[PDB]
Design a protein around this ligand. Structure first.
Ligand SMILES: [Mg+2]
Ligand SMILES: [Zn+2]
Lengths: 78, 55, 278, 420, 249, 654, 16, 215
């Protein structure tokens, strides 16, 4: 259970580096808050802009995380 | 040294008239010590301080 | 002052060696000091040569057997581990043995190089029956005392015992002022003569007590004002809290280039000024 | 502090070390006592190694008079059995006589063993390590260099065949069986005793778990009277050992004058206990958990000291658990007339002057002999050669010598008891 | 070390995370599993000052559980102080002990202040000392302080003080059980003495030198003591000097 | 056990010569398990008998055959012990003879003795018959030595005792591990695994020797040949020997130089101080083989597969697998090393889960056998399993700090120090000792026989001899053991030529010097050759957090499953007497079964914060539920604060 | 009973 | 290859010096070798000076008194056996005391030659009352080790410059079995503990040198 609390923190940290909108998008697209993965369309309605906009945000966030900077600890969690 | 701590411990056990009460005070002090230090080991520093305060 | 003489020297059947030495005159209890220091060093701090590893063709662990070989691998290891050798080169060596057919394999069948020599060519190793081949490769190393395995492929490691001296005894007699005569008896395994183990022990003691015998530029201090730097370069360095030539020497050319508004030409000027002061 | 140590210019056994540790604790504290104990441990370990103390077969010295003593005992036994065979004594008197004979032979041999150790070789390793109190006893040196003695059946009956060998000489097959009886008895006792001891400790713990110190004083004037524990003439536990840590419920006074030694409500330390014992008060009224009227517990004044600290008990101390543990810890630590009587032998040769003064009624003793039983305490009068006799009999004594007899050197004269 | 690295694993992990470059719990755990050299240094600086409770299987009284300070040793067996064996009723022929480690600050404080072994001197059941030396220590002290008429080399010599007598014994000038005289000023308790001075000599002055069996006191006429010489054994001198050095220091 | 009492566990006189009065367990089984005596046998009705020689007119008739007799039969006769001494031919010497009549010990004229026991060891068992100088030992220490002789470990190179008792060659021929030639001929083939002997004029006999097998107690059951090729062999001559025998006879320990004196505290209270020669000379080193097992089962999700495709593992930890997921024979495995690689189909490709078998913590050695059993191969696999893999791992253990060493006379000890041979005391010839034993343990335990064996062993080493002394040897003289030992020591002194071997002033003691300083000890000490054994058994255990019990959520118990140590109620009492409240409360709740406080405490320790206050342990909630399940309305209540309010029932299970 | 439930025992350092 | 470092040095009031040295790294077993050899040599084989004989005007035996002098002959002899002197010449020297009247006779009153240095200048010797004259003659010789004896009163002189030697062996394991020697030396002040250590090492080197090149 202690490698669970620890992990989330590390993830949250790298999430902080991302733009506010970006991180919110990610948290909602993976259910980090509610455990429930949400579609495009729920964020299309809940968020300001509609569908096909959240997909762009998701890719532009992941591309930021995929860099060797701002996310390399989690590589060992795999 | 270890001997020094043992002498200071014995010194505090006397003049207290209650080994339990003085153990509770040492515990509390050491707790505060570590709390306001995380910002030597707590119980040790606590005993050193209390001995040096008994003049 | 005293005179150390060798009184008796023998050689046992296992090629071990015995040597008795008489040392006199010592000074009323110095015999015990000398004798016990010699005994401790002879029994503890002498370098020897021992077989540290062995690879027996056809096996890969200690709990196996070879067809036609009377002894099991573990007994062969326990016999090779007690094989006395003396090396001349300060490197590990590999000795090769290969015996075939009905024979009693002994230490004479081990062929090291021309450097390593077997003290006892009668050490028993194994008994081979008809049609059985025993093939071994031994590795010998230098060391001291008992070395435990630390756990280069397929070589079975041995708990090596580099103990060239097997027994030391001494007795201080009255040689009458009261004077002492030390009698020192050394039994070695034959790797080195008793006289050369006594010599090595004495050398170790002398080197041990030697350290206790008696043990118990103006240009770099120049202030940067004398560097004749440009007023700009000078003011930038002084802004960087650089006050001595030592401080400037604490910076690399890159650190100099990192100085705010310090340019390459000013770093070159500083290099030229330092060359002006050598 | 401030108490300079005394230069102990004497031998140091375990009793002296325990006394020194107690004194050090009383005067210097608990960490100087720890330091002193460590230093003494280091010193003892070093000089027990420099001594080269060892054990050998010749270190087990048997007195050279063992053979003659056994021969004399066997001669007496033969006389007894010849008497039995001729009908002069009955069978339980032959049995009693041979049992008493071998118990006295065992006591004499033990005395000779101790004297031989203390006379020939006082630095013997066995003597040194048994007399100093390190690892040993006297019932074990007896079985190593003396005589094993009379043993018992697996049922309890005393086998009239004694073991007349030590572990140095080596037992026989018969003596090995007789010894194995008791060895197994002890083994089974320990195996079955451990559960009972644990059960007793548990019951004790549950009876007295709620006895915690809650009050300072219940304000009473009741207590019991503490006096020494004596077995009549002899004392078993002195009053000073029984008066340590208690609290006096009334001011004590020296029985010689009007000097007060303690006021009411005062804890007693070792010094005051020794002073009271020295002055012979013989009775002290003290407070106690027996007589304190508190709320379902004892108070601090009625309890007194906590023995682990040499101070008054603290508040909220679970003294019931301590009492239960103290009673239960030694729980797992739980031959005929010998020196419990006293033979009187006159080392003089003279005529008998008993006459008819004391009340001598004819009697048949526990052995086959006939003597005179006396109940009137009377001072023996006998012509002891040069001068008369001043021997004193006791009530119920048994005198063997009657008037008109010739007593010789160390001849048996009487028997005095000490207090179907 | 094998027990300590498992009992104090959370503390080792915390100190690896804080005082070193270890990132997460998994990395610290794998470092511990691979037996890194840094692990032992961290453990050694963790267990210092951390009391640990030792218990013997039959706990008959409260001294069956006592607190100690751990010292990392190489082996599989727990090294126990010989002076606490009677308290545990433990001997070294196969006996085993259980080790517990307090976690909270209050628990460590209670272990150090109440259950520490150096503070359990008197038996709580009788008040008598329980840390007294026994067995080989008693035999060694007895041998040191005994009297041996057979070996008395150097008997009768006088010494300035206890240190002088000890130094003379150390060289070998005086035998261990020799009857020597030492100039000791203080309280002396000598068994087998006599309260009556054996010989009283008044010199050609107001000074009398009363010679007891084990003492020689020079006293001014109707005055005070001027000197005291104790007749003793260098072993007794060593014993008393050891006690005095322990008390003074 | 609860019904057996004091009467049943004692020695009944009728045990004489039928049940040993010495060899028993210690503890709850004391007196309830016994051992048959040496000469005793059971007849066809089920009663134990024992043999006797007939005595006619005081003459022992050893020409006639032994007359066996049961307990009831030998109650009307006067039976003499087997230690009575007879003269030439058979007449009994002496004038009074101990006899047993009607379960009583008496003495009679030697003309009224009916039967005499066959041997002096007829009363004891076989393990107790192997203790020399037994009559100089206490019975309790004899029990200890007899019990501990059966816990000795076969060593790498066994060695016979020098002061053996005479029953060693007979105590080894019944275990069926020694091979003797039934044929008076020549040996034609010798090998580590095979021996062949050709009858002088006849057929060839061939024997196969067991090699590095494994016993129930993980010791090794090796078998080695003794003879060489082309050797003349007589019938009944030893051909091969077992793991605890040297040449015919039992060999459980080794003969080492011993001195009786205290060290610098390392001898304290039965501890043993040894030399470093016992480690590098491979004395008291043994082979222990362990067995590990792995099972391939069939789960509802799917079957389990043995393969090297283990998840979350690198190729640096699959070096020694045999391309089937199973380790290779002859590989050195350290702790945590994979032995058999297994994957389970877990349910939640990236679906397999790793539960491969690995070496337990603290175990290492060589792999010597990997046997595989599958239903296809025609093997009886368990009901739900599809592959049983068994791996045998062997290792060599040396003597080390924490091991138990013992002697035949009941003297046990735990090794506490291993000194370099230049720190150990040495003899007047330069030989350092092997073991130093405390003499403080001898006189209070009355096992003086150990002080006799040492001395006789010393003589035996010096005279290149081996002595067979039988127990109860004092029927021949007044002090036979001491006289024989003194005469043997004097003879050794005369043959060797060294006067320091034996001294007349102190017979058993010689001078010993200090290896650290070179100064001799003040007095001579007792030295000799002692026959010491290394006892079995892996006891070190520690735990921080592991598996928990199902109902109570308390840590499991047991070394093999990372178990915790029990804190019984005696320890709770001890902590209550100290005044400890926080140690007790942390032990009782946070470290045992406070299901939520355990994680909080662990997280606080790892993070470095303070441990929070505990809650209600899980065992209490379990007990409340069980009591409610017994139709009891037991509950926990919170008192009302104000006046006109009811007390409120508190919900613990939330 | 504070031991069974898991409270500070009313003796020692848990007295008050 | 090790490094000797004086961890501590002191000069007690009685002018007795103290020193502690750490010697490391030493191989296993070499700590005891070095420590025991050094201890034996320091305590038994160092040269020093002490008062060997003394003559007092007015007495003829050890058990005698001096009018007006609080102490007797025995106390003065014991107080002089612990008087610490250091001579610069191999020749025996004679010092003369002649204090008079009320006075506390200390070591400074001894009129040794220029070649003899009294280490402790205020070392209690005697206490003279009114109208008392203490006439004393002291002889200083060169010797080694405590030397008990069988006109001038013969004394059991203490030639030892070194008063006490202790050593302990620790474990400086980094990560084999290395040892560390901690050597404590107490000297009476005639030599510093570093000079005593140097002389002891010189004696040991001179002892072990001839055992090297021949046998
Ligand atoms: Mg035990
Ligand atoms: Zn009350």
């Amino acid at each position: 259970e202690v490698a669970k609390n620890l992990l989330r923190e590390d993830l949250e940290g790298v999430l902080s580096t991302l733009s506010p909108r970006e991180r919110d998008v990610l948290r909602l697209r993976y259910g980090l808050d509610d455990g429930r993965m949400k579609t495009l369309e729920e964020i299309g309605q809940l968020f300001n802009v509609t569908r096909e906009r959240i997909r762009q945000i998701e890719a532009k966030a992941l591309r930021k995380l995929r860099h060797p900077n701002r996310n390399s600890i989690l590589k060992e969690y795999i | 040294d270890s001997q020094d701590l043992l002498f200071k411990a014995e010194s505090l056990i006397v003049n207290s008239t209650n080994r339990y009460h003085v153990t509770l005070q040492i515990a509390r002090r050491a707790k505060q010590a570590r709390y306001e230090e995380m910002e030597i080991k707590p119980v040790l520093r606590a005993i050193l301080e209390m001995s040096d305060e008994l003049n | 002052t005293f005179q150390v003489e060798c009184v008796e020297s023998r050689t046992e059947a296992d090629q071990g060696q015995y040597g008795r030495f008489s040392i006199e005159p010592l000074a009323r209890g110095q015999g015990t000091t000398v004798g016990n220091a010699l005994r401790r060093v002879l029994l503890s701090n002498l370098e020897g040569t021992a077989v540290t590893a062995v690879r027996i063709g056809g096996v890969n662990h200690e709990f196996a057997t070879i067809p036609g070989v009377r002894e099991d691998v573990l007994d062969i290891l326990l016999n090779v581990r007690e094989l006395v050798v003396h090396a001349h080169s300060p490197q590990p060596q590999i000795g090769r043995l290969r015996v075939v057919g009905p024979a009693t394999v002994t230490a004479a069948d081990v062929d090291f190089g021309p450097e390593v020599e077997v003290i006892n060519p009668n050490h028993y190793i194994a008994s081979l029956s008809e049609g059985a081949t025993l093939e071994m490769e031994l590795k010998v190393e230098w060391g001291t005392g008992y070395r435990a395995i630390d756990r280069a492929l397929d070589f079975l490691q041995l708990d090596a015992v580099f103990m060239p001296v097997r027994r030391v005894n001494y007795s201080v007699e009255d040689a009458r002022t009261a004077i002492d005569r030390l009698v020192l008896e050394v039994w070695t395994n034959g790797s080195l003569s008793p006289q050369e183990a006594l010599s090595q022990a004495a050398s170790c003691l002398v080197a041990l007590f030697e350290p206790l015998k008696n043990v118990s530029t103006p240009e770099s201090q120049t202030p940067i004002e004398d560097l004749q730097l440009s007023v700009r370069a000078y003011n930038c360095l002084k802004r960087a809290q650089v006050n001595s030539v030592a401080d400037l020497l604490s910076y690399t050319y890159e650190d100099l280039l990192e100085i705010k508004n310090f340019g390459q030409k000013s770093a070159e000027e500083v290099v030229e000024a330092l060359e002006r002061i050598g | 502090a401030k108490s300079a140590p005394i230069f102990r210019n004497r031998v140091i056994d375990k009793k002296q070390l325990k006394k020194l540790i107690g004194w050090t604790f009383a005067h210097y504290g608990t960490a100087k006592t720890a330091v002193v104990a460590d230093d003494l441990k280091a010193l003892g370990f070093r000089y027990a190694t420099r001594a080269g103390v060892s054990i050998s077969i010749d270190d087990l010295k048997v007195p050279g008079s063992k053979a003659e003593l056994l021969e004399s005992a066997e001669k007496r036994i033969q006389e007894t059995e010849d008497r039995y065979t001729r009908g002069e004594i009955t069978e339980v008197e032959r049995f009693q006589k041979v049992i008493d004979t071998w118990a006295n032979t065992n006591d004499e041999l033990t005395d000779r063993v101790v004297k031989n150790f203390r006379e020939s070789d006082p630095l013997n390793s066995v003597y040194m390590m048994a007399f100093s109190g390190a690892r040993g006893n006297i019932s074990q040196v007896r079985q190593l260099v003396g005589m094993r003695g009379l043993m018992a059946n697996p049922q309890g009956e005393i086998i009239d065949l004694p073991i007349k060998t030590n572990f140095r000489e080596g037992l026989t097959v018969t003596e090995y069986i007789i010894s194995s009886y008791g060895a197994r008895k002890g083994l089974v006792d320990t195996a079955l005793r451990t559960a009972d001891s644990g059960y007793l400790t548990r019951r004790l713990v549950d009876v007295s778990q709620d006895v915690i110190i809650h009050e300072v004083d219940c304000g009473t004037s009741r207590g019991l009277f503490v006096e020494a524990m004596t077995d009549g003439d002899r004392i078993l536990i002195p009053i000073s050992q029984r008066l340590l840590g208690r609290v006096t419920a009334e001011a004590v006074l020296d029985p010689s004058t009007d000097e007060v030694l303690a006021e009411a409500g005062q804890d007693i330390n070792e010094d005051l206990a020794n002073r009271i014992e020295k002055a012979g008060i013989k009775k002290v009224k003290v407070r106690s958990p027996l007589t304190c009227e508190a709320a379902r517990s004892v108070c601090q004044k009625c309890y007194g000291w906590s023995l682990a600290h040499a101070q008054m008990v603290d508040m909220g101390e679970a003294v019931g658990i301590i009492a239960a543990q103290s009673i239960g810890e030694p729980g797992t630590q739980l031959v005929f007339t010998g020196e419990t009587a006293r033979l009187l032998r006159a080392p003089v040769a003279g005529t008998i002057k008993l006459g008819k003064k004391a009340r001598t009624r004819p009697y048949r003793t526990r052995h086959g002999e006939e003597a005179l039983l006396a109940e009137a305490n009377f001072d023996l009068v006998l012509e002891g050669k040069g001068r008369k006799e001043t021997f004193a009999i006791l009530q119920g004594s048994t005198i063997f010598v009657q008037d008109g007899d010739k007593v010789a050197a160390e001849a048996i004269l009487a028997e005095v008891p000490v207090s179907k | 070390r094998e027990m300590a690295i498992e009992l104090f694993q959370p503390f080792v992990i915390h100190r690896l995370i804080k005082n070193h470059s270890i990132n997460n719990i998994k990395q610290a755990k794998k470092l511990i599993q691979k037996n890194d050299p840094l692990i032992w240094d961290v453990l050694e600086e963790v267990i210092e000052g951390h009391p640990v409770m030792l218990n013997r299987a039959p706990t008959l009284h409260r001294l069956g559980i006592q607190a100690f300070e751990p010292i990392l040793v190489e082996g599989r067996a727990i090294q126990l102080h010989p002076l606490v064996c009677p308290a545990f009723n433990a001997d070294f022929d196969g006996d085993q002990m259980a080790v517990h480690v307090p976690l909270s600050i209050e628990a460590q404080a209670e272990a150090r202040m109440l259950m520490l072994a150096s503070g359990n001197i008197l038996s709580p059941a009788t008040g008598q000392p329980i840390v007294t030396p026994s067995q080989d220590m008693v035999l060694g002290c007895y041998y040191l302080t005994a009297e041996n008429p057979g070996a008395q080399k150097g008997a009768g010599r006088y010494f300035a003080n206890l240190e002088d007598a000890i130094r003379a014994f150390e060289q070998g000038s005086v035998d261990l059980h020799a009857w020597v005289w030492v100039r000791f000023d203080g309280e002396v308790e000598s068994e087998g003495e006599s309260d009556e001075p054996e010989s009283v000599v008044a010199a050609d002055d107001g000074t009398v030198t009363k010679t007891y069996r084990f003492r020689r006191i020079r006293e001014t006429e109707d005055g005070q003591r001027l000197s005291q010489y104790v007749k003793t054994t260098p072993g007794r001198i060593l014993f008393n000097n050891t006690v005095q050095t322990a008390l003074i220091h | 056990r609860e019904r057996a009492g004091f009467a049943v566990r004692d020695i009944h006189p009728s045990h004489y010569g039928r049940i040993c009065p010495i060899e028993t367990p210690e503890g709850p089984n004391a007196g309830l398990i016994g051992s048959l005596a040496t000469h005793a046998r059971v007849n066809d009705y089920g009663f134990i008998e024992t043999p006797f020689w007939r005595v006619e007119e005081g003459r022992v008739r050893k020409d006639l055959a032994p007359v066996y007799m049961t307990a009831d039969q030998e109650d009307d006769l006067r039976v003499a012990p087997g230690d009575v001494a007879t003269d030439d031919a058979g007449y009994i010497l002496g004038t009074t003879i101990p006899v047993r009549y009607r379960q009583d010990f008496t003495t009679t004229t030697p003309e009224r003795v009916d039967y005499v026991a066959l041997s002096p060891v007829q009363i004891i068992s076989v393990a107790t018959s192997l203790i020399p100088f037994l009559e100089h030992d206490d019975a309790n220490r004899a029990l200890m030595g007899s019990n501990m002789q059966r816990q000795a470990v076969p060593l790498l190179r066994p060695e016979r005792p020098l002061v053996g008792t005479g029953l060693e060659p007979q105590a080894a021929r019944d275990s069926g591990m020694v091979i003797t030639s039934p044929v008076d001929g020549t040996i034609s083939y010798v090998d580590a695994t095979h021996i062949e002997v050709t009858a002088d004029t006849g057929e060839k006999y061939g024997y196969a020797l067991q090699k590095y097998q494994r016993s129930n107690q993980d010791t090794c059951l090796n078998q080695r040949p003794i003879v060489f090729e082309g050797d003349r062999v007589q019938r009944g001559q030893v051909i091969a020997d077992g793991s605890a025998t040297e040449k015919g006879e039992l060999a459980l320990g080794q003969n080492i130089l011993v001195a009786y004196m205290p060290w610098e505290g390392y001898n304290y209270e039965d501890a043993i101080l040894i030399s470093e020669r016992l480690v590098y000379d491979d004395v008291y080193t043994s082979i222990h083989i362990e067995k590990f097992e792995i099972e391939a089962r069939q789960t509802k999700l799917g079957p389990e597969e043995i393969t090297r495709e283990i998840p979350n593992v690198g190729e640096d930890a699959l070096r020694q697998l045999d391309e089937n997921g199973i380790i290779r024979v002859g590989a050195w495995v350290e702790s945590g090393d994979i032995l058999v690689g297994k994957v389970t189909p877990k349910g939640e490709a990236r679906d397999v889960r790793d539960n491969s078998l690995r070496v337990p913590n603290g175990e290492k050695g060589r792999v010597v056998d990997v046997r595989l059993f599958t239903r296809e191969q025609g093997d009886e696999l368990p009901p739900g399993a599809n592959m049983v893999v068994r791996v045998y791992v062997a290792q060599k253990r040396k003597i080390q700090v924490g091991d138990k060493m013992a002697g035949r006379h009941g003297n046990k000890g735990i090794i506490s120090r291993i000194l370099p041979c230049e720190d150990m005391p040495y003899l007047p010839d330069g030989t350092p000792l092997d073991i130093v034993l405390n003499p403080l343990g001898v006189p209070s335990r009355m096992n003086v026989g150990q002080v006799f064996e040492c001395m006789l062993g010393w003589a035996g080493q010096l005279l290149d001899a081996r002595f067979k002394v039988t127990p109860f040897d004092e029927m021949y003289g007044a002090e036979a053991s001491r006289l024989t030992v003194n005469a043997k020591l004097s003879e050794a002194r005369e043959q060797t030529g060294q006067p320091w071997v034996f001294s007349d002033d102190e017979p058993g003691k010689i001078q010993v010097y200090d290896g650290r300083t070179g100064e001799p000890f003040d007095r001579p000490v007792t030295v000799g050759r002692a026959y010491m054994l290394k006892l079995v058994h892996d006891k070190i255990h520690a735990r921080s957090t592991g598996p928990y019990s199902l109902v109570t959520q308390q840590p499991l118990g047991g070394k093999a499953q990372q178990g915790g140590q029990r804190f019984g109620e005696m320890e709770v009492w001890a902590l209550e007497a100290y005044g400890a409240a926080y140690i007790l409360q942390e032990l009782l709740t946070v470290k045992s079964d406070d299901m939520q406080g355990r994680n909080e405490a662990l997280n606080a320790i790892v993070k470095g914060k303070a441990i929070p206050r505990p809650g209600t342990p899980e065992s209490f909630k379990v007990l409340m539920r069980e009591l409610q399940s017994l139709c009891l309305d037991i509950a926990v209540y919170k008192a009302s604060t104000e006046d006109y309010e009811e007390d409120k029932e508190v919900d613990l299970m939330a | 009973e504070n031991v069974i439930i898991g409270r500070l025992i009313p003796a020692g350092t848990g007295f008050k």
